[PDB]
Every structure is written in structure tokens, then in C-alpha cells.
Structure 1
């Protein structure tokens, strides 16, 4: 595998401060299996997300499950079996800031990871044991499938 993180997320709010943009919506989500809160921008024109939807979000280091990190360039035209065939939405971006929780003065374990998908931001916040394998200046694939 080349998976960093994987969990099922439930959408809890769609626009906290109003609809600032047409195509983009700021999804605030919470995970069942782990206590992870998720901020995520998605293009809601190509992929529409509703306030009750439940989706599976995998973050992966490589899009080919055989664990070959060979990415000189990404060719859209090329067709081979990959991980994206199982998922509806895919984004490519870079982890750019790992930051500690400020809200407790002692004995804390929550971490924030920030990923930017060309300006579509993600904050993934949770226990340090679940965010393992994130490093600054690393490039990750988000993958996302809605569940019935």
C-alpha cells in the first residue's frame, strides 16, 4: 500500500459563514472510527455534496497500489488499473504545515495537518497516532467516495 490515512466521514456543515463562492463549498465533517474533524474544500459543481452525506476519504502517497512512487509527470491520457477507479473524486496537493493544538497547556496529543490542493485547503485534526506518516513538503492524493 501507499495509504497514509483512511476513515469514513459524516458531513456536519456545508457553509459556516455563507456561500462565499459558487463552485467551492467549505465542508466541515466528523469521523466515526476516530475522533477526527475535517475541513475540506470541494468543487460542488462537478461533485455535489449535501448536508447529510457520508463519504469515505483515503489519503494516499501513490495512486498505484503496487507501491511504485514513480511520478515524473502525471499523464491523464494513460489508462492502467489504479486506485482512482474505485473512487469518485480525486485531488492532488501538498502537505504544507503541521501544527500543534494550542488549546491545552499540558499533556496534549492533537495535531493539525494542512494540505493545499492548489488553493483548496484541507485541515485534518486528530490524535498524533492517526496522522503518522505526514511530513511537510510531501505530496498526497485525496480520494473520496460517497456512501449510500
Structure 2
């Protein structure tokens, strides 16, 4: 499987502090079921998004259904099934910091996965239950698809 996280979200604010760049903007999105924050950074130029739009974000450790754990290299000449066939915006990054509300005695209750898609940042803040599949220094994908609803 390799589905490290799966949940629907909705856009609620874009670049609150003013659009800094010209092709990237902040998406301060929220969830609908797990109630988790989202600070994804998508390429607004090629994949435009407006407020109120919902999308199915799915952090997956691999793009194959069988889950063969690809090494990581651009090999377009590949006929194997790919989960990207049903997503309009896919990215590839490497989580680099898992901050949480830990203490000296009792375990953390809310984590915060910080993943960098080669420059595009994303903070999946929420409870510490559904973020068990995130470990520092590990490759991950995005696999988001806008919902027509």
C-alpha cells in the first residue's frame, strides 16, 4: 500500500502575508475529517487553484500499487502501473523535520511533518496518530487531485 496519509481538504486562504513569488503561493488549507492543518506550496502557474476548492491529498511512499520501493530516478520509459494516473498534480520530496508537542514524561499528541519538495515546503500539522508513517530522511510524494464536487 504505502499510503502514509489520506484525507480530503479544502482551500481557505492563499498567501495571507502577500504573494512573495510569482509561480508559487501558500495554501493554508484545512481538512474535513482528521482536522489537520496544511501549508502546501503548489505551482500556481501550471496548476491554478482558487479558494473553496477541495482536493484529495494522498502522501504515498511509492507510486506503484504493489509497492516495490523504487530507488528514485527519472525513468519515463516504464510501463508498470502508476498511482499518478488518477492525479492532476504529483510531487516528490523528502521530509526533513517532524516537530511535535512532546514532553519529558508523556508522549506527544500532535506532530508536524515538514517535507520539502525540492524547494516547495509543506507542513501537515495535526494529531500524532495518523502521522506514524512519517520518519525523518525519507522520500514521499503528494498525489493531490482537485475534486469537481
Interval of TM-score (by shorter of Structure 1 and Structure 2): over 0.9
Q: Deviations over 1:5-43 (max 9, x none)?
A: 000001010111111111001000000011100001000
Query: Separation in 2 of the partners of 1:106 and 1:15?
Result: 36
Secondary structure in 2 aligned to 1:143? coil
Distance 1:17-1:109 versus aligned 2 partners, 3 A rule: same
Q: Deviations over 1:99-123 (max 9, x none)?
A: 1138999885111110000110000
For 1:48, the equivalent position in structure 2 comes to 48
Equivalent pair of 2:102/2:108 in contact (CA under 8 Å):
no
Task: Could you tell me which runs of 5 or more consecutive residues in structure 1 were left unpaired when the two chains were aligned.
Answer: none
Q: CA RMSD in A?
A: 2.2
Q: Deviations over 1:40-94 (max 9, x none)?
A: 1000111001011100000000100101113252313434321000111000000
Distance 1:96-1:107 versus aligned 2 partners, 3 A rule: closer
Distance 1:52-1:92 versus aligned 2 partners, 3 A rule: same
Query: Separation in 2 of the partners of 1:73 and 1:118?
Result: 14
Query: Separation in 1 of the partners of 2:103 and 2:122?
Result: 20
Query: Separation in 1 of the partners of 2:59 and 2:25?
Result: 20
Query: Separation in 2 of the partners of 1:107 and 1:119?
Result: 31
TM-score (structure 2 length as normaliser): 0.92
Which structure shows the bigger proportion of residues in strand conformation? 1
After TM superposition, the structure 1 stretch with the greater mean CA deviation from structure 2, 9-18 or 93-102, is 93-102
Distance 1:73-1:106 versus aligned 2 partners, 3 A rule: closer
- Quote the offset at 1:140 in angstroms: 0.1
TM-score (structure 1 length as normaliser): 0.92
